[PDB]
A paper describes a structure:
A key enzyme involved in AQ biosynthesis is PlAntI, which catalyzes the hydrolysis of the bicyclic‐intermediate‐loaded acyl carrier protein, polyketide trimming, and assembly of the aromatic AQ scaffold. Since the natural substrate of PlAntI – a highly reactive, ACP‐bound modified octaketide is not accessible, we focused our study on a stable surrogate. Upon ligand binding, no major structural rearrangements are observed in PlAntI, and the catalytic triad remains perfectly aligned (rmsd = 0.4 Å over 374 Cα‐atoms). The planar naphthalene ring is cation‐pi‐stacked with Arg24 (distance 3.5 Å), while the hydroxyl group of the ligand is in proximity to the catalytic nucleophile (Ser245OHγ, 3.4 Å) and interacts with the GLDS loop motif of Gly173‐Ser176. Thus, the specificity pocket in PlAntI consists of the GLDS β‐turn, with Asp175OHδ (3.0 Å) and Leu174NH (3.5 Å) forming interactions with 1‐OH.
Residue numbers in the entry:
A (entry chain A), B (entry chain A): 5 to 381
Write the structure that this text describes.
């Protein structure tokens, strides 16, 4: 027999998603090893290389679920707490990539996201970071909220810390990609706030995604204001992908509540829904819980009034070849918003510039620190 | 223009090395992101896909050096210590993969390994782990030695800790792959000992690799014996690749000095030198500092006398399709060494079973803990 390997065709086919799957080298956030991708794709059915097809992402979910199951078996039979957590993290990462682009079975997708959240809540007891977990009541909506503090934090010894609020994209999971981003701010002795708004994290497939997410961010700001451990005059809001769109909304509506805002490849409007690749349509359809015919109408409502003033400092990281949020619309916003907006545009980079994420998160993390220092920190 | 990507041909060509390049998801040890591989291989010259060729690994070194240089620029212009260290780690990882399979310019290879060691020694001041760095004098040889302690270690509060000694392979760097392995033992509140024997780490290309490495391990055991912080009755020796061969030697000569020994894909003898792929010959040639004609004679001297008794518990992880250390020779040793030896053989896995490294290091780390517990810990 030959050594277990990913077929040349399939490996080349998934080139767009490989940067997404590996994402950031994290300390706490679940992350796959190369071997996990091999375990998933080594026995992937032949003649199935269409990313637009529903058949491809079914087999993707099936095969990634198998690797997830294997790590849960290791976790259950683990002889130490450290080994148990390592296995649970690997399982959580595998289950996320199984579901993140799977929208065919609503019940199965919710189940996989419930697995990940169960693993996350259970891991908190073994964590060496203080995690204040509670529900924020916004009207009738009970929003899952997590306030995480830096390593070796003591309330008595330390002064009120700055806090960074981070928002999910359309297909991200809170304790995976967003916790991965959050570690760059925890590393700089900042508190971090991660949340599941309507249609976000565990709520994806249950409640429709709220276009007016700033309403839910306002409720987080109110909590941080009342929290003595948090310096409410030193707040940042970060958004990634569709989360970046919410960042631009926050900058317009409640921007004066923040020292700075980070937009990771969000835009003032999305490209033509019909012309989107076939999986992004289903992605958007599932997040908003609407059919094909209704989506272009929602995209029209989403389109921002760029005229409305920017109430704080905004830093945007965007790729030239972004096929979701078109660069021309972002450069239009950059010119109009003027000195309040900073644009880091990457040549020959796709949506979220994932080939540059390590270097641009170093720059982004330093930029946020500078904005707090400029506000007398 | 198209998005920056690794060519399907080159990505398929490097399938054997991708598990090696990404290795383990580490906290401290330098590690590449997917984007770093893209930055290295995106502009790799076309019609250059021969892994046996000297031209391929020159361009490999050139292109990986470029990514290393980029991270050093980020490190120098970094606005924080945390950002500086993140960049230095990325640079160190990039420079290692530039040199690890490059043997054409001895001066350039030593320079790249000197860059990595300089970055490592400079990072120690920013480390939250206690790193006792000194030289162990073995005859006339000044051996670089690093004794690292677990997170939040206090000598006064804590009792004498167990310590794991880890050995380099032929083409590994101490603060990259071996520190990555070491983190599994630091996570279990064990001290770790990593060293540069003759022809190992910074000494590769300077001094020939010592076949009798147990002589240098004996000097480490003597230091750990004299060290009050280390429980010398609770010692383990781990070796990876050719380091695994040293582990089998240690088990025979000074095995009674260790509770247990871990052999990660070492063997009692190497396959026919002439029949090795063309880059492993140059690899072995460079490590031993000998020409093609002399190597098969050294391989004959290397071959262990399996008859000699095993003086401690040994755990071997090996792949069925290992083309360096043949499985039949390891299974021969397993049968003869009997109850003292445990074999974890992976079906359809190559040398070091890199597609399984996460799961087998979880099992290995738990096995070592169990052997210490059996010796009254
Ligand atoms: O929706 C997202 C959230 C976080 C990261 C992403 C990267 C690529 C594409 C989409 C993403
Ligand atoms: O020599 C080595 C040291 C550490 C890890 C390795 C993995 C594969 C092949 C060789 C290796």
């Amino acid at each position: 027999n030959k050594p277990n390997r990913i077929s040349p065709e399939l490996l080349a086919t998934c080139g767009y998603f490989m940067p997404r799957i590996f994402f950031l080298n994290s300390q706490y956030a679940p992350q796959v090893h190369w071997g996990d991708v091999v375990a998933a794709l080594s026995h992937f059915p032949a003649g199935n290389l269409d990313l637009s097809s529903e058949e491809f992402w079914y087999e993707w979910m099936i095969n990634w679920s198998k690797v997830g199951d294997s790590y849960i078996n290791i976790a259950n039979s683990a002889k130490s707490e450290v080994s148990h957590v390592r296995a649970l993290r690997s399982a959580a990462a595998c289950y996320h990539w199984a579901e993140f682009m799977y929208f065919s079975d609503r019940s199965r997708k919710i189940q996989l996201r419930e697995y990940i959240r169960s693993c996350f809540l259970s891991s908190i007891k073994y964590s060496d970071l203080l995690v204040d977990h509670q529900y924020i009541v916004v009207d009738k909506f009970h929003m899952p909220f997590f306030l995480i503090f830096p390593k070796g934090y003591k309330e008595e010894e330390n002064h009120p810390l700055p806090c960074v609020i981070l928002s999910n994209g359309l297909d991200s999971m809170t304790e995976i990609e967003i916790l991965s981003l959050a570690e760059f701010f925890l590393g700089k002795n900042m508190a971090v706030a991660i949340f599941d708004g309507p249609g976000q994290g565990i709520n994806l497939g249950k409640s429709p995604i709220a276009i007016d997410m700033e309403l839910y961010v306002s409720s987080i700001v109110k909590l941080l204001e009342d929290d003595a451990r948090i310096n409410s005059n030193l707040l940042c809001f970060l958004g990634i992908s569709f989360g970046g769109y919410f960042a631009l909304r926050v900058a317009q509506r409640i921007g004066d509540k923040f020292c700075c805002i980070v937009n990771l490849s969000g835009g003032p409007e999305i490209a033509e829904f019909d012309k989107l690749p076939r999986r992004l349509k289903e992605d958007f359809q599932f997040a908003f819980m609407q059919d094909n015919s209704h989506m272009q109408s929602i995209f029209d409502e989403i389109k921002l009034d760029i005229s409305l003033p920017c109430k704080t400092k905004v830093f945007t990281v965007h790729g030239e070849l972004d096929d979701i949020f078109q660069i021309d619309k972002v450069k239009k916003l950059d010119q109009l918003w003027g000195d309040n907006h900073q644009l880091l545009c990457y040549e020959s980079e796709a949506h979220v510039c994932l080939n540059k994420i390590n270097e641009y998160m170093i720059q982004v993390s330093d930029w946020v620190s500078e904005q707090f220092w400029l506000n007398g920190y």
